């Protein structure tokens, strides 16, 4: 898989902060942090264009993003909340091409 997501799951307790990291080896100019609830599509929550930039999505509520090199795309949950458990992904990109990671299961008790 050309795109990492880690952990792959994560149990967090209310009030944690919580990083998801997304690492690429597609060189690929672009990252994207999704959400996907049950019975939903994926949301957007911020994407990056390069090294040093984020961009609020369409649901940026609640987490903020890194793009700490042209590899590395973090979603930060500064403050977990239940409202946050779902099942997250990652994707590199360039023009309309998406890559996806394999998905991070998360859980907020």
Same mark, same amino acid.
């Given at each position: 898989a &050309?795109? =990492? /997501? !880690? $952990?792959? +799951?994560?149990? &967090? @307790?209310t009030?944690?902060?919580v990083?998801?990291?997304c690492?690429?080896? +597609? +060189?690929?100019? +672009?990252?994207?942090?999704?959400?996907?609830?049950t019975?939903?599509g %994926?949301?957007?929550?911020?994407?990056?264009?390069g090294?040093?930039?984020?961009?609020?999505?369409?649901? $940026?509520?609640?987490?903020?993003?890194?793009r $700490?090199? /042209?590899?590395?795309?973090?979603?930060i949950?500064?403050?977990? =909340? $239940?409202?946050? !458990?779902?099942?997250?992904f990652? &994707?590199?990109? @360039?023009?309309?091409? %998406?890559?996806?990671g &394999?998905? =991070?299961?998360?859980? @907020?008790?």
């Open positions: &050309a795109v =990492t /997501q !880690s $952990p792959r +799951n994560k149990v &967090a @307790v009030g944690e902060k990083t998801l990291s690492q690429q080896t +597609n +060189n690929h100019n +672009n990252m994207y942090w999704y959400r996907q609830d019975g939903h %994926l949301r957007l929550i911020h994407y990056s264009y090294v040093g930039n984020t961009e609020k999505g369409d649901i $940026p509520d609640g987490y903020e993003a890194s $700490p090199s /042209q590899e590395q795309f973090s979603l949950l500064v403050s977990a =909340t $239940p409202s946050q !458990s779902s099942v997250y990652c &994707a590199s990109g @360039v023009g309309g091409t %998406l890559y996806f &394999a998905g =991070t299961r998360l859980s @907020v008790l």
